[PDB]
């Protein structure tokens, strides 16, 4: 039963014109339908409607990309400008001590010079970056001179690493009782991200992240012996896929990211109070099958007392490269490029002697970004599932397997890319590589803007597809959809590039 306070609350939780719960129940029990809905529809205003606005070939308009200073690189490691100091080594995956491998790779290039800055940070203490590189090199020499190679090396807590890794930077936590009259006491700056425009470099990076390399960046273990015919067909198709995807450079980026995030996570979970030194490593098989090990650069994890799964562990990332920053200065906004050496590479002409650069920067990653970077191998699954779906869909019509001619005969091709001559077709191999590169870049440049844009643009893409199928689409408020889409494009280079692709697709479609 209901009595006392519960009844006094129940008497106040009824439609406005009722006074007691019992009266409301008596009214409802005696209720019988007498055209109330049809009576209120006419009474309601006629301005409340759902007018259908037909969607036609002319209705859609290009998305309104933001305007501002050009965007800059934000990935945790250089993608297109990534030198590799390699040394042939008969080892697999994790075999070997990373520090020993790194020092051995470093002892192959003999052109080291005295570092000097060639593109300052514009906001930092660049001499600090120069001294950090000096200290890292001295520490590598130190470890090399030692008898045994420690599994991990903890850097000395000097002023340069202390500033670069942002130590003692956090304001001291205090209760509000005394910090009340402070003149500048405010709320944490929470404002819309600074708007930035689309640059030309992201397109070139995505281009280079789809080409076929001359190595083998992924070497997968064995699988249970095949017995059923489906297993044999699957093995043939899987050979095709793993050949067409192991040589892509997007797989090199996958492996780099996986290794970097794994190493950072393991080092930050153990040495939560010392500055480690985590060299970047990646191993591949050359075209002749010889094994190799690569050394992109070094990472110096900072103090990493991570509590929530969003905290930040600062790590100054030092990377080699051959590209001079004085060509796309708006892209290297947050780095502190130095000139460390002068390689003597061999080309179709022979010796060329280009200078070598070191792209130093501070950076940070949280305990969730590290996890989702360690789990970066699902890009292969996404792209390969799409390709498998396409191949099976085609092969259903023709009662026989179609993978062989798809990958070898250079048969039916898909429209991928856009050249001045028009849209350029691409074979199934290039479609697989392009989808894999798209997934890898989604993983690398993940952000809320990407999620919002992806959803709000899938909506418009489905509308356009319905138009192209002569289904007579129709929208209630298209302007609202466009405004929602354009609200997501703020400053993320990947989101801007995706919006550019969508504009190009709308241009080519409906025409």
């Amino acid at each position: 039963e209901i009595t006392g306070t519960m009844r006094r609350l129940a008497d106040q939780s009824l439609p406005p014109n009722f006074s007691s719960l019992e009266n409301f129940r008596a009214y409802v029990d005696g209720f019988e339908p007498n055209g109330y809905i049809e009576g209120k529809l006419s009474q309601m205003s006629k301005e409340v409607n759902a007018r259908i606005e037909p969607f036609l070939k002319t209705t859609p308009r290009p998305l309104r990309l933001p305007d501002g200073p050009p965007c800059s690189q934000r990935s945790k490691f250089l993608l297109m400008d990534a030198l590799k100091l390699s040394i042939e080594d008969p080892s697999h995956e994790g075999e070997g001590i990373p520090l020993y491998d790194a020092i051995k790779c470093m002892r192959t290039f003999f052109g080291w010079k005295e570092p000097n800055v060639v593109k300052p940070h514009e906001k930092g203490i660049n001499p600090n970056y120069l001294l950090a590189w000096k200290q890292v090199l001295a520490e590598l020499q130190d470890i090399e001179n030692e008898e045994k190679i420690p599994k991990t090396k903890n850097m000395k807590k000097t002023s340069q690493l202390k500033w670069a890794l942002g130590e003692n930077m956090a304001p001291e936590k205090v209760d509000f009782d005394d910090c009340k009259d402070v003149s500048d006491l405010k709320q944490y700056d929470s404002d819309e991200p600074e708007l930035r425009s689309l640059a030309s470099w992201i397109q070139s990076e995505f281009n280079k992240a789809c080409e076929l390399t001359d190595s083998s960046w992924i070497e997968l273990d064995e699988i249970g012996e095949d017995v059923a015919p489906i297993e044999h067909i699957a093995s043939m198709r899987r050979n095709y896929f793993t050949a067409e995807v192991s040589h892509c450079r997007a797989t090199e980026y996958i492996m780099k990211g996986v290794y970097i995030n794994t190493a950072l996570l393991n080092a930050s979970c153990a040495a939560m109070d010392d500055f480690q030194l985590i060299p970047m490593i990646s191993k591949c098989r050359t075209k002749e099958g010889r094994r190799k090990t690569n050394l992109y650069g070094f990472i110096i994890k900072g103090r990493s007392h991570l509590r929530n799964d969003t905290d930040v562990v600062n790590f100054v990332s030092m990377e080699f490269s051959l590209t001079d920053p004085r060509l796309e200065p708006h892209k290297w906004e947050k780095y502190c490029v130095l000139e460390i050496g002068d390689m003597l590479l061999r080309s179709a002409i022979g010796q060329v002697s280009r200078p070598m650069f070191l792209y130093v920067r501070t950076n940070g990653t949280s305990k969730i970004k590290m996890k989702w970077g360690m789990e970066m191998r699902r890009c292969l699954l996404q792209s390969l599932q799409q390709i498998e779906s396409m191949i099976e869909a085609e092969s259903s019509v023709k009662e026989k397997d179609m993978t062989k001619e798809f990958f070898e005969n250079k048969s039916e091709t898909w429209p991928i890319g856009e050249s001045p001559k028009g849209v350029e077709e691409g074979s199934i191999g290039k479609v697989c590589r392009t989808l894999l590169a798209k997934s890898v870049f989604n993983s690398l440049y993940a952000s809320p803007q990407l999620e919002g844009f992806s959803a709000e643009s899938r909506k418009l893409l489905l509308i356009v597809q319905a138009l192209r199928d002569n289904l007579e689409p129709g929208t209630f408020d298209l302007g609202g959809l466009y405004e929602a889409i354009e609200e997501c494009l703020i400053n993320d280079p990947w989101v801007l590039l995706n919006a550019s692709w969508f504009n190009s697709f709308l241009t080519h479609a409906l025409r």
């Binding site: 297109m80 400008d81 076929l212 050979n239 050949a243 067409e244 061999r346 080309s347 179709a348 191999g429």
Partner: peptide, 25 residues
């Protein structure tokens, strides 16, 4: 199966910018 991209340009670039040779090898 050995992948072969028509845009291969295996001779177009004088040297791979990322994975060079430098060393006498």
């Amino acid at each position: 199966y050995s992948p072969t991209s028509p845009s291969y340009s295996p001779t177009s670039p004088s040297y791979s910018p990322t994975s060079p040779s430098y060393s006498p090898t």
